[PDB]
Amino acid sequence: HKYLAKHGMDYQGRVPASPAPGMYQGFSDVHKILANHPKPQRESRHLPVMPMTPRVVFEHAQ
Amino acid sequence: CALCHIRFRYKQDYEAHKESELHVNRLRWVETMNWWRETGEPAYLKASNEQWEWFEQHVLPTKAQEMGCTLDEARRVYRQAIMTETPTWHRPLQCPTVKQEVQEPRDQRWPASPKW
Amino acid sequence: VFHNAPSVYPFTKPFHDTPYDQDRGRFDKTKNILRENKWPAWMDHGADGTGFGIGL
Amino acid sequence: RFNPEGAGLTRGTSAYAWKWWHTQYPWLPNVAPADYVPPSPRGIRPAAWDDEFAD
Amino acid sequence: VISYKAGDYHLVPKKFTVGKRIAVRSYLDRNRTELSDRTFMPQKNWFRPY
Amino acid sequence: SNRFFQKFYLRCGNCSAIQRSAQGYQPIANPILFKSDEHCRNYHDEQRRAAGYSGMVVTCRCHRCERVHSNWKVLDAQQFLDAKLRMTPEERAQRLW
Amino acid sequence: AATPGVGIAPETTPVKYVPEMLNIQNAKWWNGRGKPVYR
Amino acid sequence: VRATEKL
Amino acid sequence: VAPWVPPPRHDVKVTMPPPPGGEVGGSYGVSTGYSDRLARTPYWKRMALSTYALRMKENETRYPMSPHREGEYDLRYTVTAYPDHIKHRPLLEIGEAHQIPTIEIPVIFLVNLWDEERLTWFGRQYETVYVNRNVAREELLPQRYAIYATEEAYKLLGLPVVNHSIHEEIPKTPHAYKKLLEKQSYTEERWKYTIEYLFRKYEADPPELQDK
Amino acid sequence: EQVQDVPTSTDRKPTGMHRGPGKRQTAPKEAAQYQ
Amino acid sequence: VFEEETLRERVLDRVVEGVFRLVPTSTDRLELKSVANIIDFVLTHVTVARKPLQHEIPEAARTVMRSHPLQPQLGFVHALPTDNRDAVVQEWERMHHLDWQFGKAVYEPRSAENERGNLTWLREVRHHEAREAFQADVDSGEARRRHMAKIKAAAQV
Amino acid sequence: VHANRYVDHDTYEEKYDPHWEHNAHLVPDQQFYNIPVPKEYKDAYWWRDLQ
Amino acid sequence: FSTFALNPETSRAPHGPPRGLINRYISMGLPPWAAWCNRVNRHALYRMSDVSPRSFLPKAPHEMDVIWMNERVRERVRTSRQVQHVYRQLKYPFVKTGIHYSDTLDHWVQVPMVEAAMFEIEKDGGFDNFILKRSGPELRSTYGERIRRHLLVRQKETQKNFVLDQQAKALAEVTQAELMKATSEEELDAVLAKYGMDAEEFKRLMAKRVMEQRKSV
RNA sequence: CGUUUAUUAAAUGCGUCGGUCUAAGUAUUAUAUUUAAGAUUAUUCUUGUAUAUAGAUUUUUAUUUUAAU
Ligand SMILES: [Zn+2]
């Protein structure tokens, strides 16, 4: 829906996982408007860091 | 029959409607209203004028000298407001009956009456 | 005493059901709006994942 | 259950609209950033638009 | 003279009114089919003056 | 229908002649064949006179300008003494009786 | 969860059924919370 | 501007 | 917490309490006024600041009436301090049907207005006309053609003050109105009831003796 | 009185769209109009 | 909707840069993608251009409004009632013509007043003509006399 | 406090009206001792003078 | 109550204290519905003598919005049909949409008001005066206090917009003594430059006026 | 094929069908119901409710409701 519009084709390739930095920035509890993936990032290029939601910290505690 | 808001379900009465007491009466009413607007009103308030202006020129001159005032001033003592007249706002058309019917003992009882 | 609202009987009764409404009282529930709280955010939900700043 | 960036929302309210019913958040009206001041008839003309054009 | 045929000024502009009486509008008369141009045409904006 | 007596002091508007017009005893419409409209509006109307002609046009003929009009201001009898006591002894012959 | 017990009156006539309409006694000393407001 | 308009 | 409790409403007189509230504009329900300014100042003080010629002007008993609410009985002598219920009664009593008919009010026209349908005059300029209650409010007043014919409206315009008794009494029944039309037809449009207007028919020869 | 031939009806559209007794007949305000 | 870059640049260099010689920032170029928004963006940056009206008064006329007897009270704008709250809850209510309704009024500052039927205008133009008439005495001096007649009524008593 | 204040055409501020304080109706308050308002605008505060 | 046909008015009861039962309750001020009480306890003839009316306001006096001039929701005790059950009910007044033209603020304004206000408005000379002579706790409205403010401004704006006509006529009068002769149209600039009342605005404004001499003919 | 306080030809549920709705939601739709899917078929006849109705009642049966001794 963003490759089809800008390229005139079906993507016809494996889509990258790990949503691009800058997507879903207003969302707060994504977890569904995503896979259970983390909120992607800021629109930055800094190294990926898990936004330590209360959930991620619990997994560390497991 | 939009005139009287009537949908007709049975034929043979849609025919007998045009002279029905509902239609013919609604005909008279929506007509006499036209009469009032067509001829009446533009002539009724014509005469209402042609008598007032008669007064304020044929009678009020002499009347203003009776108050000892100026002529223009009396046109606010003899007509404090011009209550024109409409179909919707007539003062009683007929001065009510002066000789009222005589009361009677109740059920035509004659030597007075024990009860009411 | 449900009708402590601006009396408007033939018009639409603005807000009627919406969060910022009259005819619902003052010390009511349904006041999530008023989430504005003087206390800093971090002390009612921790500064990070481990609920650090939490407390009184 | 809200969806910010929802291409509805009137684009002023994406936080205040989580509250408000489904039936009332599309209609919530556009107002201002609450810090945007009215268009002000001040005298600052674009840097290079210049007079003759401005006049 | 100032002519006047009656049935002229309604006291309320003829948009906000029924024959006489201002009419009620309450976001329930309105459809959601307007406001659906938002999917492409973005809402009005307040461009701050530079 | 006023069971009780009361005299007002009506002040004309044309000549301000404070004339007094009383209200006698006019008996109640018969209760034997009762009529609910003619009674309960006889009574409610009676409070409206008893409170100094509250919601009624006053129609009495003047004594100074001999004519009947509807221009009277009903004076409560301590607004009357406010007026009567404050008129030179000659105008008491003019406006009062 | 709650109940006014009065039943919401029309939005035009906001008050039908005052408790006095039923010859109710609500002295502050009798049932406590009594004394009405239209008073 | 009002004093203007009189003249 | 009340810092600076206000002073009583009408405490302006030196040796008598201020009139009760409500009468001055406040809350009814209490008969006797009281002001702690007056009750604290010892008696000689209250007799110092005042001469005998003055107390007889503020002793002054306006007994039934109220000196402040002009025209209404003093609310410290009624059965209870509330306003007189009887004078200010709602227009509909507790049982009657609302058959208050259409009423036509007097308005002072301000511009020579000339109907183009009846081709005659709604009203000359500066003459009071009895117009409908919902022509006046909705068509004659919003445009500046007319105003009401109140006493003070006459004062503002330059006309001899005339008392139309504008809604001095509303009629609650058609035949209770069609009597009020008879009263108002006499005071207002009086030329209808002259010995000269009752005899336009006869200012000259009885018609049966004139030419043809 | 010679004017008592009031048509027992009137043009006014009957309020009360549904149905019932007393519809579409003269009113004592309309009976004084035609009079 | 001027969305595709090829279309926006085809309009922005011509109308907002060419015709008007305006220049839009990057973040506003985002929402500057419709005929409705192009009109407003101009109609803010051209409204912020009119030199703020310069209230400049002369001197010769200035001394008139000073010595003139009748001066203006001029504080009323504050008495006006405030409707301050969240702008959305304040403007949601004006969902329709809730403007002149229920004791509200869109007060636009008015500089001239209609004189016909305006009670509060005739209510003072007579009170003024009752001030010019009283002022006539003090001009001639019948006020001082009629005022000096009180103290001679209030002296021998 | 700024209602009915002759603006003077030198300092463009309110001239000190000595009369104003006499046509002023001190409406009370909790965070203020007694706010002064001109007489004409007194009735809008009818509840606070009753509270 | 007397039985004769024509009972001319008189000072006192002509035939002794009026007989009958309903004359017994009128002789004590009560209304003629006391004839239908089964118990007339000392509270009852208090209750029904209307010493203080059993009648209240729908909302608080402070929160009241719709302009109820002098009304309450009086309860009307009705007796039912064939089997006479007595029940009571609260009867309201009739509130109309008061869509008036208050010429103070030269625009229509709507405040819902009981019928009794739509009469006492016209008895007061306008809608605004009815807002203005009533006072606070008397006009116990809330809309009436939002529209009194605009009324108090848009009056003190007329008075302000009046003194314009007295500061303008002052200039117009005092400048005419310097528009005295049409010798120099370079001087008409200087007199206008004196009061800073520019020419380009005045010249065409007078032109539009002589055209208005031709627009009005 | 689910689901129930004395646990099931209880009551759900899909389809069809009847009625309602084009100024709050898409009339191959959603409200409001009666039935029960699948497969055959779905008969005869009307006195009342409803609809339509014409100041109302009283009258009055295209479809629907209930009825058929
Ligand atoms: Zn007289």
Q: How far apart are CA M182 and CA D14, in angstroms?
A: 68
Does the annotation place F40 within a ligand binding site?
A: no
For residue E4, give the chain I residue with the closest CA. I115
Q: How far apart are CA K74 and CA L4, in angstroms?
A: 6
With H, G, I as helix, E, B as strand and everything else as coil, classify residue K13.
helix
CB contact under 8 A, E4 and I138: no
**Listed residue (B78, B86, B80, B76) closest to B48, CA to CA:** B86
CB-based contact, K43 to chain E, within 8 Å: no
B9 touches strand N (CB under 7 A): yes
DSSP collapsed to 3 states, chain M = CCCCCCCCCCCCCCCCCCCCCHHHHHCCCCCHHHHHCCCCCCCHHHHCCCCCCCEECCCCCCCCCCECCCCCEEEEEEECCCCCCEEEEEECCCEECCEEEECCCCEEEECCEEHHHHHHCHHHCCHHHHHHHCCCCCCCCCHHHHHHHHHHHHHHHHHHHHHHHHHHHHHHHHHHCCCCCCCCCCHHHHHHHHCCCCHHHHHHHHHHHHHHHHHCC
With H, G, I as helix, E, B as strand and everything else as coil, classify residue B43.
helix
Query: Can you give the resolution of this entry in Å?
Result: 3.6
In the Cβ-directed half-sphere of K114, how many Cα atoms lie within 13 Å?
Answer: 14
Radius of gyration over every alpha carbon of chain B, rounded to an integer in angstroms: 26
CA of M89 to the centre of ligand 1 (A): 48
Among all chains, which residue has been given the structure tokens 């309110």?
L14
With H, G, I as helix, E, B as strand and everything else as coil, classify residue F75.
strand
Q: How far is the CA of I58 from the C1' of N12 (A)?
A: 88
J21 touches strand N (CB under 7 A): yes
Q: How far apart are CA M68 and CA J3, in angstroms?
A: 43
DSSP state, residue K14: I
Q: How far is the CA of M206 from the C1' of N12 (A)?
A: 89
Buried b / exposed e across I156-185, counting CB within 10 Å, b at 16+?
beeeeebbbbbbbbbbbeeebbbbbbebbb
DSSP assignment of F59-96, as one string?
A: --B-SSS--B-S--EEEPHHHHHHHHTTS-TTGGGTT-
Residue A37: alpha-carbon gap to chain centroid: 6
Query: Encoding tokens for residue I101?
Result: 């008919």
In the Cβ-directed half-sphere of I8, how many Cα atoms lie within 13 Å?
Answer: 20
Handedness of CA M19, M21, M26, M27 (dihedral sign): positive
Query: Encoding tokens for residue F14?
Result: 């044309």
DSSP state, residue G14: -
M77: Cβ contacts below 8 Å, ≥ 6 apart: M86, M87, M88
M134: Cβ contacts below 8 Å, ≥ 6 apart: M144
Instruction: Specify the experimental method.
Output: cryo-EM
**Listed residue (K80, K104, K93) closest to M107, CA to CA:** K104
Does residue M1 contact residue M22 with C-beta atoms inside 8 Å?
A: yes
Query: Encoding tokens for residue B22?
Result: 């509902």
E33 touches strand N (CB under 7 A): yes
**Listed residue (M55, M94, M45, M47) closest to M76, CA to CA:** M55
Measured between beta carbons, the chain D residues lying within 8 angstroms of C17 are: 21, 24
Does residue L48 contact residue L29 with C-beta atoms inside 8 Å?
A: yes
Let me know if chains D and I touch, i.e. at least 3 Cβ pairs under 8 angstroms. Answer: no
Length of chain L as a residue count: 51
J28 touches strand N (CB under 7 A): no
Query: Encoding tokens for residue G12?
Result: 């035009």
Q: Which residues pair with M78 in a beta bridge?
A: M87
Q: How far is the CA of B11 from the C1' of N47 (A)?
A: 24
CB contact under 8 A, E42 and K101: no
Q: How far apart are CA I34 and CA I19, in angstroms?
A: 8
Strand-pair category, E2-3 with I113-114: parallel
CB contact under 8 A, E30 and D33: no
For residue K124, how many other CB atoms are within 10 A of its CB? Answer: 19
Phi (first) and psi of residue F39, to 5 degrees: -90, -60
Among all chains, which residue has been given the structure tokens 């029904």?
M48
For residue M30, how many other CB atoms are within 10 A of its CB? Answer: 20
Residue M177: alpha-carbon gap to chain centroid: 48
With H, G, I as helix, E, B as strand and everything else as coil, classify residue K129.
helix
Q: What region, left, alpha or beta, does residue I66 occupy, with left being phi > 0 and alpha being psi -120 to 50 degrees?
A: beta
Angle at CA B17, nearest 5°, toward B16 and B22? 135
Residue K4: alpha-carbon gap to chain centroid: 44
I71: Cβ contacts below 8 Å, ≥ 6 apart: F52, F76, F79, I65
For residue I141, give the chain E residue with the closest CA. E11
Let me know if chains G and H touch, i.e. at least 3 Cβ pairs under 8 angstroms. Answer: no
CB contact under 8 A, L4 and M156: yes
I47: Cβ contacts below 8 Å, ≥ 6 apart: I15
For residue K129, give the chain I residue with the closest CA. I156
What is each CA distance from B88 to J5, J29, M175, M207, in whole angstroms? 18, 8, 58, 52
With H, G, I as helix, E, B as strand and everything else as coil, classify residue K139.
helix
For residue I130, how many other CB atoms are within 10 A of its CB? Answer: 25
CB contact under 8 A, G21 and M54: no
| Largest CA-CA distance found in chain F, in angstroms, rounded | 55
DSSP state, residue B92: P
Q: How far apart are CA K74 and CA L36, in angstroms?
A: 17
CB-based contact, L50 to chain M, within 8 Å: yes
Q: How far is the CA of B7 from the C1' of N51 (A)?
A: 14
CA of I173 to the centre of ligand 1 (A): 29
Query: Encoding tokens for residue K101?
Result: 């309704």
Q: How far apart are CA C42 and CA C50, in angstroms?
A: 12
Alpha helices in chain F (DSSP H): 36-50, 77-84
Q: How far is the CA of G1 from the C1' of N5 (A)?
A: 26
DSSP assignment of C1-56, as one string?
A: -TT-S---SSS--TTTTSSS-SSS-SS-S---S----SS-GGGTS-SSTT-TT---
Residue C9: which of G4, G8, G12 has the nearest Cβ? Answer: G12
Q: What is the identity of the amino acid at F15? A: C
Q: Which residues pair with B18 in a beta bridge?
A: none
Q: What is the identity of the amino acid at E23? A: A
Among all chains, which residue has been given the structure tokens 């012959």?
F93
Q: How far apart are CA M69 and CA M61, in angstroms?
A: 12
Query: Encoding tokens for residue K2?
Result: 């001027």
Query: Encoding tokens for residue M152?
Result: 């108090």
I56: Cβ contacts below 8 Å, ≥ 6 apart: none
Interface of K with D (CB under 8 A): 20-23, 43-45, 47-53, 86-88, 91-92, 95
Query: Encoding tokens for residue K147?
Result: 């005022």
Query: Encoding tokens for residue F26?
Result: 């006019």
E-strand stretches of E1-50 = 2-3
Q: Which of residues 1-39 of G touch C (CB under 8 A)?
A: 4, 8-9, 11-12, 14
I192: Cβ contacts below 8 Å, ≥ 6 apart: I185, I186
Query: Encoding tokens for residue I206?
Result: 């009885």
Residue C24: alpha-carbon gap to chain centroid: 11
CB contact under 8 A, M136 and L44: yes
CB contact under 8 A, K77 and M125: no
DSSP assignment of chain D, as one string?
A: ---SS-S-GGGT-SSTTTSS-TTTSTTPPP---SSPPP--------TTT-TTT--
DSSP state, residue L37: E
Q: How far apart are CA K78 and CA I28, in angstroms?
A: 32
Handedness of CA F66, F67, F71, F73 (dihedral sign): positive
Angle, helices K119-140 vs M143-176, to 10°: value is: 50
Phi (first) and psi of residue E27, to 5 degrees: 55, 5
**Listed residue (M157, M171, L40) closest to K73, CA to CA:** M157
For residue L18, how many other CB atoms are within 10 A of its CB? Answer: 7
For residue F5, how many other CB atoms are within 10 A of its CB? Answer: 13
Does residue I190 contact residue B44 with C-beta atoms inside 8 Å?
A: no
For residue G21, how many other CB atoms are within 10 A of its CB? Answer: 14
